[PDB]
Amino acid sequence: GFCWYVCARRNGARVCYRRCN
Questions:
Q1: Strand spans (E) along 1-21
Q2: How far apart are CA 9 and CA 16, in angstroms?
Q3: Residue 18 · residue 5 · CB < 8 Å
């Protein structure tokens, strides 16, 4: 029961989203 947001650099674009394990 834990979630967090991670940012990544795809095609020169910063993509951020929250996910859960």
A1: 3-10, 13-20
A2: 9
A3: yes
